[PDB]
Amino acid sequence: AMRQCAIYGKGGIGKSTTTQNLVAALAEMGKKVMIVGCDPKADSTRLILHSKAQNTIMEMAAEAGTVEDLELEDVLKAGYGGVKCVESGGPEPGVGCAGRGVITAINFLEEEGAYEDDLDFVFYDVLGEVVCGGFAMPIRENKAQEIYIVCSGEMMAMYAANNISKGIVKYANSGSVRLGGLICNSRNTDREDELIIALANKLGTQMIHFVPRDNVVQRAEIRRMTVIEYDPKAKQADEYRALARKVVDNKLLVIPNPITMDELEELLMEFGIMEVEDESIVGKTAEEV
Amino acid sequence: AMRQCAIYGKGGIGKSTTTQNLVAALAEMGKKVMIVGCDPKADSTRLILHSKAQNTIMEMAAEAGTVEDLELEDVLKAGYGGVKCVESGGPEPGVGCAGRGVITAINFLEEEGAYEDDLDFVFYDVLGEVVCGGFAMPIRENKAQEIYIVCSGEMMAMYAANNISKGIVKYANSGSVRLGGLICNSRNTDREDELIIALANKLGTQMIHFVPRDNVVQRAEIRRMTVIEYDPKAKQADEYRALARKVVDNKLLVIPNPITMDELEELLMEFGIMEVEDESIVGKTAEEV
Numbered sequence: 277a278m279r280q281c282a283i284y285g286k287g288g289i290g291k292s293t294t295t296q297n298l299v300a301a302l303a304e305m306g307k308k309v310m311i312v313g314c315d316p317k318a319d320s321t322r323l324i325l326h327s328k329a330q331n332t333i334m335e336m337a338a339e340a341g342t343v344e345d346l347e348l349e350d351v352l353k354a355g356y357g358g359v360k361c362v363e364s365g366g367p368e369p370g371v372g373c374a375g376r377g378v379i380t381a382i383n384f385l386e387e388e389g390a391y392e393d394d395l396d397f398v399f400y401d402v403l404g405e406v407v408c409g410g411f412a413m414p415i416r417e418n419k420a421q422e423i424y425i426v427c428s429g430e431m432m433a434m435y436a437a438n439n440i441s442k443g444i445v446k447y448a449n450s451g452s453v454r455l456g457g458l459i460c461n462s463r464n465t466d467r468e469d470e471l472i473i474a475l476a477n478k479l480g481t482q483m484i485h486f487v488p489r490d491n492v493v494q495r496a497e498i499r500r501m502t503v504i505e506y507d508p509k510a511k512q513a514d515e516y517r518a519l520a521r522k523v524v525d526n527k528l529l530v531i532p533n534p535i536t537m538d539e540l541e542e543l544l545m546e547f548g549i550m551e552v553e554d555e556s557i558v559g560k561t562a563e564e565v
Numbered sequence: 566a567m568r569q570c571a572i573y574g575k576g577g578i579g580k581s582t583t584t585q586n587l588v589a590a591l592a593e594m595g596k597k598v599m600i601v602g603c604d605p606k607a608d609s610t611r612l613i614l615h616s617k618a619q620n621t622i623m624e625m626a627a628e629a630g631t632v633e634d635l636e637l638e639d640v641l642k643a644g645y646g647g648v649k650c651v652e653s654g655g656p657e658p659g660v661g662c663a664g665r666g667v668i669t670a671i672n673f674l675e676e677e678g679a680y681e682d683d684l685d686f687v688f689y690d691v692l693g694e695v696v697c698g699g700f701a702m703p704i705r706e707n708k709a710q711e712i713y714i715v716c717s718g719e720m721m722a723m724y725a726a727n728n729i730s731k732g733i734v735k736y737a738n739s740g741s742v743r744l745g746g747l748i749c750n751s752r753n754t755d756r757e758d759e760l761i762i763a764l765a766n767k768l769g770t771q772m773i774h775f776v777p778r779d780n781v782v783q784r785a786e787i788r789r790m791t792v793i794e795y796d797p798k799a800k801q802a803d804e805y806r807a808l809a810r811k812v813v814d815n816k817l818l819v820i821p822n823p824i825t826m827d828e829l830e831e832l833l834m835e836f837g838i839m840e841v842e843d844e845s846i847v848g849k850t851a852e853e854v
């Protein structure tokens with residue numbers, strides 16, 4: 277019943293916002309959901325709590341001395357729709373692998389039996405910028421089963437998306453770690469919907485949603501809350517409900533097929549974000565050409 | 566004579582472009598420089614080599630079996646102005662700390678006596694997104710002495726700049742690792758020049774340069790080359806020469822003074838990128854307000 281899910285993707289494309297907003301649609305339709313905040317900024321829970329920045333397991337363990345001197349009630353908060361929220365906390369600048377904050381944070385929650393407490397969903401909001409051993413921690417430790425990659429029709433978000441996938445693949449043979457699909461966050465670039473579906477099937481998954489750039493997300497997030505919470509009778513709000521729908525309904529859980537550099541640039545050139553570079557101009561000064 | 570330098574800063578603000586371009590200015594004014602490519606994409610050497618993507622120590626060790634089956638001549642290339650170039654290589658997606666690629670890469674170069682070979686400069690192009698143990702590796706192993714942080718008048722690039730600094734500070738007491746200054750890459754935001762000098766002196770360093778958003782950089786980089794190489798008699802070109810000038814001349818090497826979150830938002834609000842948020846609208850639906 278209780279599924280183990282993760283949201284992976286790069287920063288600056290509104291990953292957390294779509295994660296939180298999704299989780300809110302999912303709460304209002306009956307489910308009890310818990311978000312684990314694996315990003316080094318506390319932005320993973322912000323909108324559900326109406327918080328400036330939630331208290332994290334790292335800064336609080338730094339407080340009470342050790343990780344066990346914390347009580348569950350202090351780290352794990354609940355906001356909108358009784359959505360349980362924790363921020364894992366960043367690696368202490370200079371020292372500390374990021375992924376070791378996350379084991380600390382999951383371990384702590386297993387031992388205070390939050391996982392065995394009545395729950396339908398867990399959602400790890402995870403940075404999928406570089407996929408190092410550190411950010412791969414939910415996948416290697418098999419705490420995330422269903423991976424949904426948020427991305428956009430833009431080079432880095434895509435490369436990012438592929439890499440997340442190569443990680444899924446590393447731990448294919450070890451367990452139930454699978455790519456459930458790609459969510460596109462629009463950047464009002466032309467061909468981006470179908471570019472992300474080109475990528476989605478060339479990987480062997482779908483593009484389970486397309487999230488439109490609606491200026492109500494901005495207006496709801498300045499009030500530190502979801503769009504499902506701010507204006508439930510909105511266009512965008514039903515988009516979040518629709519995504520959240522497709523997610524329960526998803527049965528499509530796969531081991532992906534990473535593509536190469538030339539193949540990513542292929543897809544980037546034919547939909548138009550990338551240009552066909554000229555070979556004769558290369559290495560030549562404006563003197564020359 | 567041979568100074569050990571590093572360029573730290575976040576992605577997507579044109580760090581490598583300014584690194585490479587700087588290094589070119591420095592080359593035409595007589596010096597012999599080597600760039601070490603610590604970013605997971607091969608973008609750190611690209612413009613000096615006119616290469617699509619240079620061959621990295623990770624993918625080539627994966628080729629010959631072990632790191633010692635590689636010959637110096639294969640990894641270390643030279644381009645414009647006899648600027649020696651290597652790409653370190655990323656962590657293999659899923660497994661591998663990023664910083665362990667970098668020790669491998671430096672170690673390999675110490676042993677084939679590239680460091681003892683006549684050289685005035687070494688420049689580690691390093692991602693300073695999160696400052697984990699992994700990206701702190703040049704600082705903990707004291708291979709970078711002079712850190713220059715490229716940033717912009719934008720929240721994340723500044724936060725990032727602060728964190729790089731907290732890392733400098735961790736290894737204050739261990740050696741000669743010092744913050745030489747902040748380089749601003751313009752994003753044609755109003756107050757950004759003086760915002761980065763606010764930040765610069767609130768940290769205890771200067772803003773050793775301001776690099777203007779000139780559309781010749783774009784036109785030179787599409788030809789896979791520097792602006793010093795493409796059009797030497799250009800406005801931007803002299804900017805790179807001027808930066809490179811101030812760098813030799815720099816004597817100002819410090820241990821920085823990291824600022825807080827409230828202090829960062831202070832500076833963001835008074836120069837105008839950040840807005841003064843309203844307290845009464847928070848937590849309230851459009852029904853309510």
Ligand code: SF4
Binds near residue numbers: 372373
């Ligand atoms: S695995 Fe990655 S998160 Fe951990 S230290 Fe290494 S580079 Fe940082």
